[PDB]
Design a protein around this ligand. Structure first.
Ligand SMILES: NC[C@@H]1O[C@H](O[C@H]2[C@@H](O)[C@H](O[C@@H]3[C@@H](O)[C@H](N)C[C@H](N)[C@H]3O[C@H]3O[C@H](CO)[C@@H](O)[C@H](O)[C@H]3N)O[C@@H]2CO)[C@H](N)[C@@H](O)[C@@H]1O
Ligand SMILES: [Mg+2]
Ligand SMILES: [Mg+2]
Ligand SMILES: [Mg+2]
Ligand SMILES: [Mg+2]
Ligand SMILES: [Mg+2]
Ligand SMILES: [Mg+2]
Ligand SMILES: [Mg+2]
Ligand SMILES: [Mg+2]
Ligand SMILES: [Mg+2]
Ligand SMILES: [Mg+2]
Ligand SMILES: [Mg+2]
Ligand SMILES: [Mg+2]
Ligand SMILES: [Mg+2]
Ligand SMILES: [Mg+2]
Ligand SMILES: [Mg+2]
Ligand SMILES: [Mg+2]
Ligand SMILES: [Mg+2]
Ligand SMILES: [Mg+2]
Ligand SMILES: [Mg+2]
Ligand SMILES: [Mg+2]
Ligand SMILES: [Mg+2]
Ligand SMILES: [Mg+2]
Ligand SMILES: [Mg+2]
Ligand SMILES: [Mg+2]
Ligand SMILES: [Mg+2]
Ligand SMILES: [Mg+2]
Ligand SMILES: [Mg+2]
Ligand SMILES: [Mg+2]
Ligand SMILES: [Mg+2]
Ligand SMILES: [Mg+2]
Ligand SMILES: [Mg+2]
Ligand SMILES: [Mg+2]
Ligand SMILES: [Mg+2]
Ligand SMILES: [Mg+2]
Ligand SMILES: [Mg+2]
Ligand SMILES: [Mg+2]
Ligand SMILES: [Mg+2]
Ligand SMILES: [Mg+2]
Ligand SMILES: [Mg+2]
Ligand SMILES: [Mg+2]
Ligand SMILES: [Mg+2]
Ligand SMILES: [Mg+2]
Ligand SMILES: [Mg+2]
Ligand SMILES: [Mg+2]
Ligand SMILES: [Mg+2]
Ligand SMILES: [Mg+2]
Ligand SMILES: [Mg+2]
Ligand SMILES: [Mg+2]
Ligand SMILES: [Mg+2]
Ligand SMILES: [Mg+2]
Ligand SMILES: [Mg+2]
Ligand SMILES: [Mg+2]
Ligand SMILES: [Mg+2]
Ligand SMILES: [Mg+2]
Ligand SMILES: [Mg+2]
Ligand SMILES: [Mg+2]
Ligand SMILES: [Mg+2]
Ligand SMILES: [Mg+2]
Ligand SMILES: [Mg+2]
Ligand SMILES: [Mg+2]
Ligand SMILES: [Mg+2]
Ligand SMILES: [Mg+2]
Ligand SMILES: [Mg+2]
Ligand SMILES: [Mg+2]
Ligand SMILES: [Mg+2]
Ligand SMILES: [Mg+2]
Ligand SMILES: [Mg+2]
Ligand SMILES: [Mg+2]
Ligand SMILES: [Mg+2]
Ligand SMILES: [Mg+2]
Ligand SMILES: [Mg+2]
Ligand SMILES: [Mg+2]
Ligand SMILES: [Mg+2]
Ligand SMILES: [Mg+2]
Ligand SMILES: [Mg+2]
Ligand SMILES: [Mg+2]
Ligand SMILES: [Mg+2]
Ligand SMILES: [Mg+2]
Ligand SMILES: [Mg+2]
Ligand SMILES: [Mg+2]
Ligand SMILES: [Mg+2]
Ligand SMILES: [Mg+2]
Ligand SMILES: [Mg+2]
Ligand SMILES: [Mg+2]
Ligand SMILES: [Mg+2]
Ligand SMILES: [Mg+2]
Ligand SMILES: [Mg+2]
Ligand SMILES: [Mg+2]
Ligand SMILES: [Mg+2]
Ligand SMILES: [Mg+2]
Ligand SMILES: [Mg+2]
Ligand SMILES: [Mg+2]
Ligand SMILES: [Mg+2]
Ligand SMILES: [Mg+2]
Ligand SMILES: [Mg+2]
Ligand SMILES: [Mg+2]
Ligand SMILES: [Mg+2]
Ligand SMILES: [Mg+2]
Ligand SMILES: [Mg+2]
Ligand SMILES: [Mg+2]
Ligand SMILES: [Mg+2]
Ligand SMILES: [Mg+2]
Ligand SMILES: [Mg+2]
Ligand SMILES: [Mg+2]
Ligand SMILES: [Mg+2]
Ligand SMILES: [Mg+2]
Ligand SMILES: [Mg+2]
Ligand SMILES: [Mg+2]
Ligand SMILES: [Mg+2]
Ligand SMILES: [Mg+2]
Ligand SMILES: [Mg+2]
Ligand SMILES: [Mg+2]
Ligand SMILES: [Mg+2]
Ligand SMILES: [Mg+2]
Ligand SMILES: [Mg+2]
Ligand SMILES: [Mg+2]
Ligand SMILES: [Mg+2]
Ligand SMILES: [Mg+2]
Ligand SMILES: [Mg+2]
Ligand SMILES: [Mg+2]
Ligand SMILES: [Mg+2]
Ligand SMILES: [Mg+2]
Ligand SMILES: [Mg+2]
Ligand SMILES: [Mg+2]
Ligand SMILES: [Mg+2]
Ligand SMILES: [Mg+2]
Ligand SMILES: [Mg+2]
Ligand SMILES: [Mg+2]
Ligand SMILES: [Mg+2]
Ligand SMILES: [Mg+2]
Ligand SMILES: [Mg+2]
Ligand SMILES: [Mg+2]
Ligand SMILES: [Mg+2]
Ligand SMILES: [Mg+2]
Ligand SMILES: [Mg+2]
Ligand SMILES: [Mg+2]
Ligand SMILES: [Mg+2]
Ligand SMILES: [Mg+2]
Ligand SMILES: [Mg+2]
Ligand SMILES: [Mg+2]
Ligand SMILES: [Mg+2]
Ligand SMILES: [Mg+2]
Ligand SMILES: [Mg+2]
Ligand SMILES: [Mg+2]
Ligand SMILES: [Mg+2]
Ligand SMILES: [Mg+2]
Ligand SMILES: [Mg+2]
Ligand SMILES: [Mg+2]
Ligand SMILES: [Mg+2]
Lengths: 273, 47
RNA sequence: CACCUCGAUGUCGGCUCGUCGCAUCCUGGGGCUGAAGAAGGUCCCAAGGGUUGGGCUGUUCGCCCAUUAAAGCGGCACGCG
RNA sequence: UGCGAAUGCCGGCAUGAGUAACGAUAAAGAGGGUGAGAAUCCCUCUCGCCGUAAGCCCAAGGGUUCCUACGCAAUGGUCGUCAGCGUAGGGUUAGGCGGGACCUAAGGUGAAGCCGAAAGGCGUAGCCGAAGGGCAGCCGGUUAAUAUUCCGGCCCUUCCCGCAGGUGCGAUGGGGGGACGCUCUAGGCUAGGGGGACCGGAGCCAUGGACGAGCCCGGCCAGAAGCGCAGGGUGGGAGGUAGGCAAAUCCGCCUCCCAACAAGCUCUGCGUGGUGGGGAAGCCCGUACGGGUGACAACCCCCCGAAGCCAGGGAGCCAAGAAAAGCCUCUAAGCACAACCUGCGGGAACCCGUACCGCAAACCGACACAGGUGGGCGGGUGCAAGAGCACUCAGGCGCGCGGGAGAACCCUCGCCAAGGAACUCUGCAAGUUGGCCCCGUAACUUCGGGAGAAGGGGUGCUCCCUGGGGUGAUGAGCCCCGGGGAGCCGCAGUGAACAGGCUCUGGCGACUGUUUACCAAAAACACAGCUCUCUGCGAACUCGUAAGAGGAGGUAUAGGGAGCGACGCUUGCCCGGUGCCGGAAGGUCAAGGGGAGGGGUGCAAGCCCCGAACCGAAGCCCCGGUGAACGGCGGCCGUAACUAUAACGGUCCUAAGGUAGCGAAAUUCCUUGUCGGGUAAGUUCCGACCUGCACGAAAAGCGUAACGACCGGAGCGCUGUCUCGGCGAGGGACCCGGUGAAAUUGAACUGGCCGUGAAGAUGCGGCCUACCCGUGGCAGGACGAAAAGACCCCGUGGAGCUUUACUGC
RNA sequence: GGCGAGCUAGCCCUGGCCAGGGUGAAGCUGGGGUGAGACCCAGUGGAGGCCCGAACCGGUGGGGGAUGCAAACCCCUCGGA
RNA sequence: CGUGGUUCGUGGAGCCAUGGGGGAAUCUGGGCGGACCACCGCCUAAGGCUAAGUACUCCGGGUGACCGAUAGCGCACCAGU
RNA sequence: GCGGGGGGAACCUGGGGAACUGAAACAUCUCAGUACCCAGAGGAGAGGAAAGAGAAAUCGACUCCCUGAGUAGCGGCGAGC
RNA sequence: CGCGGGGUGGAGCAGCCCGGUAGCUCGUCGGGCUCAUAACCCGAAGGUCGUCGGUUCAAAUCCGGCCCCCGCAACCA
RNA sequence: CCGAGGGUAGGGCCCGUGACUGGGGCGAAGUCGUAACAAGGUAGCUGUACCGGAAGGUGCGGCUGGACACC
RNA sequence: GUGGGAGAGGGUGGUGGAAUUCCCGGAGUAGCGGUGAAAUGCGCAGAUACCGGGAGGAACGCCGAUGGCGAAGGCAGCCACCUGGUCCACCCGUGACGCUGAGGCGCGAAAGCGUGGGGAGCAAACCGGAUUAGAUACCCGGGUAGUCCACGCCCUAAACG
């Protein structure tokens, strides 16, 4: 857990790096499974559509398997546990017995010697994947399909998990990491357990630079702008928000709920407060 | 100190070049105008 | 007040450099004194010269330290970019 | 159709004025030559200046500027016989260097598709795209001028055709590889450099000494196969096989068998290599330039040693480090006479670039402009090191006006008696200090720091002894790092150049960072960190009419918005208003449904027109919540057995009346508050108190080590800051020869005073003073120049900004 | 309606650059310690928006320039490195 | 219903056009004559083509109470230089 | 196999479509369906043979000129059209 | 100088604004309860409405002036 | 050479003193309230934590040195 | 040593039901709550009381004692794992090997503290209702931290027999 540092410099005093002892690999990854990728936070027309992104470290994109249901029944050996820098989480390398190699996001409690399967068959054990309809109520669970065959969208972030509260008809009831309560179709795969590298949330960036490395450029407050620039800017000598606090674009950033109202998705949501 | 003309022969031709101008209706009408005005050179030099 | 100047008359203070006025701070000459002497007071003559260094403050001013014969007040576009 | 005005327009020519300047203070002097003519061109000598450059090479960019002949009108800040200038001729040679008949990257374009009033926008595959990947040439000689291009020598690549030997061949398809970070870094090499008593070499003994194991010059370069050293990559066999969108013998995966090692296989580097080639000083002529001998040159030992090579080397770390082709391998059709593989041999091998400048007089800066411009190499000695600094190689240059004088004054610099901040807004500026080694080093602290704290001692040369290291042998020599002893000289030994002044104490900001290109670098921005808030994923949000995209190939430990801003200890009360959040009732509510009743017109059947009740969203009202949401957090009167003061009470109002902390403050008007400290003297500063005009808790409150080209206050050290100036140097200023601007300018024959006048007169009145004209100087005046005042108002002038202004989108 | 990111700001792809010195993190090894530890010390090690300081990037203070060498320069000084 | 055109700006607002919803008939059928109804008239929508009379002046020519090199085109001249 | 593509001073039709300005402020209105941009057309282009006018039992496709007429109207019944 | 509010029994507030009427809480006084005091119960007293003029029939109330009080403002300069 | 000591520089400890500040002792009859001693009228005490003019109050846990009627 | 024994002794992982609160659905009507008595609060927007469903946290009723365990603080539903102390019977082994214990080290209720979680009920602070002269209290309605878990600190006590 979380290497610390003596203060031989300012900012070496609070910095905190991950315990990598979990990582069995280093400089990989399985060259058959990864392309590359790029961006700027700019979009097809050239324009910043997400503010304060850029620079930071080059990355190769580990391709990872969010469909477990196309290998139904083939088993797999956990071959390695290694460092994906596109995600909070860790990715286990697994060899199937096909000889097919695949990345999965690596559950908490997953040692690398072990066997993993997916399908209705499927022992309920860390790493396996099943239709939600075959997973016993109360199981914590991660990498959950939202809709059948469409891939896992739910609880992939380091430390996350979700939980089966019960069943209704074709649907089972999940408590997402958000606490929202949600019905997901029985047929959606999910892998059993929690995501792990749960210690993630406690790293301490420690210096401005550690943010730059991650591609996070400085973030300048409305308060520090002029009125051309932002609903709060001017007066100066500071200024209170002078108005209900606002985005650059004028909408209100305290309390104001932006989920669209008529989304047919609401029939399947019961919660989150 | 550094100044505003930093000649680069490629940039001249991909920016003000003839195929630039033709690629775009703004630029075809630049050629239309330059021609109808009787410009000797419709479009910049670069070697 | 709103007369010249808004097709521009640069504004405080400092410094430099002065020059002039006298309603005189000192020195010179005087009357009165509730002037014994000394030392003051107040007023008259008198512009020749003189009129310190320093702490504080942008300061002018002022307060203060140490001296002084005395540490004068004013004008000169609040003299002088 | 008549011009005097428009800071009018166009042109011409004046004034200023022979004035300022002539563009780095690196610096010149003479002799000879040339010529009509020479400070300025040529050659010689002497002097001086660059030398991590002011030398050499490359890429941009520039485009004949290159070389040579003939020229000097202009261009050249003077001159010019000279030139980057005029005229004219000449000059750029590649299968291997660069780029294309190769690959892909961002991006671009784009069959398919998608979207858009039109123009067009997007987009998979593909295509295009390079300073990245792939790819075969090294050394010398040659021209006035080009050379990895021509030539000499020694190598190599592809394609085509043949022959031989080998083999299931075969691709746009599968697989391997290519293929990768940042720090640090091993071993062996080379580049490069130093030294030699050894090798080779014209020549020299001057001026006192020196004929020497003297002095000065040089002592290498390239080189296939083979080989040797140093490294890189690298298992072999079988069986199974369901994966690698067909196929596979390949790759993947499982099991068994032997290798563990580079053993082998293989690739590269270096070295050596047949051979080829250079080869100094000097002296002689003879050169923009270089050319003979020296020479038959010598051609070797030692050491220093990369950042370069071996190269996919190794280690550690986290922020986790391109693609695709060449290349190999696998099979599909298809063909197995073919095809491919290997070696040899003959043939074939296109296009463009190539001159010259290239830190600049040839590029960007209107200029031969003190500016700007990416990669490489950049020698020697000494100073700890080093690309630093001084001198210096090669090489390059004295900056395209000069000569004199030796005033003021200005700039840049040197020194100063006594004093030592008295200077001044401020020690601004300058001075001090200054490198290295050693002693030594406080508060406080987040235990790292603070620290180079502070403060000191050492620092040269000679002789003696002496310890370990690298290289060699375990040897010497050569280098490296030391240690001890005894002496020498001077004012002084980091003897010159480069190289912190320090201390105390406040405010602000945690810290390194960021900023107003070109008056603000900061207490501003950012920043790790904390909190609120939105967002279940075709996410929220952003751009776009849309398609599409960003978000994100992310998924609540994530992503968006907002505030606060390391850390410590903390962040109180008010929900009445506003905002947001929740509320299936109620009220009002638009189109629409409704059609009671009324109307126009028809002979009428009808056609047409109104139209009440009632049903009918969101929003608003209403109900509640909500503070790290916008925000807000009282007044008057009385009271104690001196006095004062008021723990205490009364009352009025509020949604609630400011808690902790802090406080004359980056906030205190009165104000230089009062007291204390510092000083001889303190409107600042520091410590207090509290009467807080008008602090106060995430537009955070109070602190806080460390940090700061921030802002304040004090001391020591030290000084030309000052008392208070003096002297000296140089570049100007002055004089002479050459060249020769500028703003401004109604015209001028252009005095002072006291008046006067639109109120500040050279110009009017009176009086005074005053021969004509210049030079060098100073700035009082011409309400001096400059800029149609920026402040101020005016205009029903403009623009940016805000909002519960209006009205729209 | 068009022309501009050859200046400048941001990002994207691909390369390159950062003399020399200093200080001495974790880790590792050994020793000591303990019931086993934590931990202590030594060596090694070579971390860091670490320190001094060229190249490079700057632009702090002051002087100079002000019809400039220059429509932002020069000199001394200074920040990062 | 929402708009455009017409002189028509919502007006008593017809006509012509039509983005949206509903949605006929073939002469006894349909549009129109300024809301609407009656009468009286006009005309035959939802397919298409059609000279001439009209616009213009790169070009050629003819003519000026048009200019004469600061005029006349920007260009009398190798100027869109 | 035939055709398309692109250009042309101005002129033509179509799709789109401003602001200054005017209203002595300014929103409706004006400038103006102008400027402009886009597509197509030609030597012209558009229009064109009545589901028309509109009070006459009248006219007879369309274009262009004069006139009707600054009339009928329109209009913050304002400017104006 | 300026603009807005205020001055009412002893204290703090209503009442003015809309003419005629002065009210609420505390205090003070008389009486109870208590051994006693407060607390508590029953009772009373108490103001010309800053002041000076006017209007009216009548003025705390409407108007003017003066005297104070609280507040706001004083900017470009 | 050592060397009294003088000088310069930086530490340590100790006494004294200082605007102001903190509580404390003590001083016949001042002000506020009633915490405690009787079940002291809320049993008290208590470590600690928050709050409040003040005594104190409340929370959590603890101690007894506290407890003939009522469901 | 052997053979036995009782036990909420400690650490870990599980797990059970009762109840409270919250939500959904049913049915149902005008009050419910609360107190000394009341008010605040909740309720026709359909509460309270009743039934069904779900969520979640915390504490373990009867057994239970005047009891057992532990050195102390302390320990109480049930299951398992791991683990301490201790008692009895035997009279087997070693042979004074003992007792205490300044320092040291370790444990240490509650509250508090840091970092994550969790958060039902309760409840400092706080708000409101009442009481009172006042009532920053006692009672009533609310209510955050906390109470719970992991890890790490704090090191106190009427830590008492
Ligand atoms: N030891 C002093 C401590 O602190 C306080 O003591 C101080 C005060 O509380 C106490 O003051 C008392 C007061 O309570 C009492 N109710 C009124 C009385 N007059 C006062 O008394 C004081 O005042 C007068 C002066 O007037 C002195 O003469 C007299 O000595 C002294 N007692 O007097 C003490 C000082 O003298 C507490 N009483 C208590 O904690 C303890 O006694
Ligand atoms: Mg684009
Ligand atoms: Mg970087
Ligand atoms: Mg920010
Ligand atoms: Mg700003
Ligand atoms: Mg903008
Ligand atoms: Mg705005
Ligand atoms: Mg604001
Ligand atoms: Mg402000
Ligand atoms: Mg630069
Ligand atoms: Mg031509
Ligand atoms: Mg006037
Ligand atoms: Mg007048
Ligand atoms: Mg003026
Ligand atoms: Mg003038
Ligand atoms: Mg002037
Ligand atoms: Mg006199
Ligand atoms: Mg006398
Ligand atoms: Mg005199
Ligand atoms: Mg001062
Ligand atoms: Mg004063
Ligand atoms: Mg003056
Ligand atoms: Mg001046
Ligand atoms: Mg005329
Ligand atoms: Mg005239
Ligand atoms: Mg002159
Ligand atoms: Mg001159
Ligand atoms: Mg010169
Ligand atoms: Mg010169
Ligand atoms: Mg030199
Ligand atoms: Mg050198
Ligand atoms: Mg070129
Ligand atoms: Mg030449
Ligand atoms: Mg000349
Ligand atoms: Mg020439
Ligand atoms: Mg190509
Ligand atoms: Mg070819
Ligand atoms: Mg390609
Ligand atoms: Mg495109
Ligand atoms: Mg390339
Ligand atoms: Mg290349
Ligand atoms: Mg090549
Ligand atoms: Mg060569
Ligand atoms: Mg060449
Ligand atoms: Mg094959
Ligand atoms: Mg491949
Ligand atoms: Mg001799
Ligand atoms: Mg010599
Ligand atoms: Mg040698
Ligand atoms: Mg060789
Ligand atoms: Mg020879
Ligand atoms: Mg490696
Ligand atoms: Mg340069
Ligand atoms: Mg260079
Ligand atoms: Mg040159
Ligand atoms: Mg020159
Ligand atoms: Mg230059
Ligand atoms: Mg450079
Ligand atoms: Mg050195
Ligand atoms: Mg140098
Ligand atoms: Mg001196
Ligand atoms: Mg001194
Ligand atoms: Mg200074
Ligand atoms: Mg020095
Ligand atoms: Mg020192
Ligand atoms: Mg010597
Ligand atoms: Mg230094
Ligand atoms: Mg201050
Ligand atoms: Mg800072
Ligand atoms: Mg830095
Ligand atoms: Mg800023
Ligand atoms: Mg600036
Ligand atoms: Mg700075
Ligand atoms: Mg997407
Ligand atoms: Mg993506
Ligand atoms: Mg801030
Ligand atoms: Mg702050
Ligand atoms: Mg707050
Ligand atoms: Mg509120
Ligand atoms: Mg509310
Ligand atoms: Mg509200
Ligand atoms: Mg309703
Ligand atoms: Mg509604
Ligand atoms: Mg409300
Ligand atoms: Mg409070
Ligand atoms: Mg104060
Ligand atoms: Mg003070
Ligand atoms: Mg204040
Ligand atoms: Mg102070
Ligand atoms: Mg503040
Ligand atoms: Mg706040
Ligand atoms: Mg502070
Ligand atoms: Mg501080
Ligand atoms: Mg800084
Ligand atoms: Mg600073
Ligand atoms: Mg001087
Ligand atoms: Mg001189
Ligand atoms: Mg005269
Ligand atoms: Mg006069
Ligand atoms: Mg006259
Ligand atoms: Mg003169
Ligand atoms: Mg003058
Ligand atoms: Mg002068
Ligand atoms: Mg003007
Ligand atoms: Mg107006
Ligand atoms: Mg206006
Ligand atoms: Mg650019
Ligand atoms: Mg750019
Ligand atoms: Mg370099
Ligand atoms: Mg270094
Ligand atoms: Mg080092
Ligand atoms: Mg280091
Ligand atoms: Mg650094
Ligand atoms: Mg500077
Ligand atoms: Mg600056
Ligand atoms: Mg540095
Ligand atoms: Mg219309
Ligand atoms: Mg109409
Ligand atoms: Mg009909
Ligand atoms: Mg019709
Ligand atoms: Mg009709
Ligand atoms: Mg009609
Ligand atoms: Mg008709
Ligand atoms: Mg004529
Ligand atoms: Mg003529
Ligand atoms: Mg002309
Ligand atoms: Mg003429
Ligand atoms: Mg002309
Ligand atoms: Mg055409
Ligand atoms: Mg049109
Ligand atoms: Mg107008
Ligand atoms: Mg206007
Ligand atoms: Mg036609
Ligand atoms: Mg036609
Ligand atoms: Mg037609
Ligand atoms: Mg019109
Ligand atoms: Mg009355
Ligand atoms: Mg001694
Ligand atoms: Mg001594
Ligand atoms: Mg009591
Ligand atoms: Mg009590
Ligand atoms: Mg009690
Ligand atoms: Mg309380
Ligand atoms: Mg047990
Ligand atoms: Mg046991
Ligand atoms: Mg025995
Ligand atoms: Mg404890
Ligand atoms: Mg606890
Ligand atoms: Mg409660
Ligand atoms: Mg006990």
């Amino acid at each position: 857990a979380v290497k610390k540092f003596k203060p031989y410099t300012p900012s070496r005093r609070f910095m905190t790096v991950a315990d990598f002892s979990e990582i069995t690999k280093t400089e990989p990854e399985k060259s058959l499974v990864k392309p590359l990728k790029k961006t700027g936070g700019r979009n097809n027309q050239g324009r910043i559509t997400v503010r304060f992104r850029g620079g930071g470290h080059k990355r190769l994109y580990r391709i990872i398997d969010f469909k477990r249901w196309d290998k139904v029944g083939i088993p797999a050996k956990v071959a390695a546990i290694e460092y994906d820098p596109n995600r909070s989480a860790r990715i286990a390398l697994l060899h199937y017995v096909d000889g097919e190699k695949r990345y999965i996001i690596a559950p908490d409690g997953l040692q690398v010697g072990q066997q993993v399967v997916a399908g209705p068959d499927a022992p309920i054990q860390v790493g396996n994947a099943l239709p939600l309809r075959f997973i016993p109520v109360g199981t914590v669970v991660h990498a959950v399909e939202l809709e059948p065959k469409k891939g896992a969208k739910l609880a992939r972030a380091a430390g996350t998990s979700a939980q089966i509260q019960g069943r209704e008809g074709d649907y089972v009831i999940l408590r997402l990491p958000s606490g929202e309560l949600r019905k997901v179709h029985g047929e959606c795969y999910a892998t059993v357990g929690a995501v792990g590298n749960a210690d993630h949330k406690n790293i301490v960036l420690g210096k401005a630079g550690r943010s730059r490395w991650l591609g996070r450029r400085p973030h300048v407050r409305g308060a520090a702008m002029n009125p051309v620039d932002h609903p709060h800017g001017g007066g100066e000598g500071r200024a209170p928000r002078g108005r209900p606090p606002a985005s650059p674009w004028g909408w209100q950033t305290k309390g104001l709920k932006t989920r669209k109202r008529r989304k047919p998705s609401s029939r399947f949501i019961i919660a989150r407060r | 100190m550094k100044r505003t003309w930093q000649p680069n022969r490629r940039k001249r031709a991909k920016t003000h070049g003839f195929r630039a101008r033709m690629r775009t209706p703004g630029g075809r009408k630049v050629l239309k105008r330059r021609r109808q005005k009787g410009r000797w050179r419709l479009t910049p030099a670069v070697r």
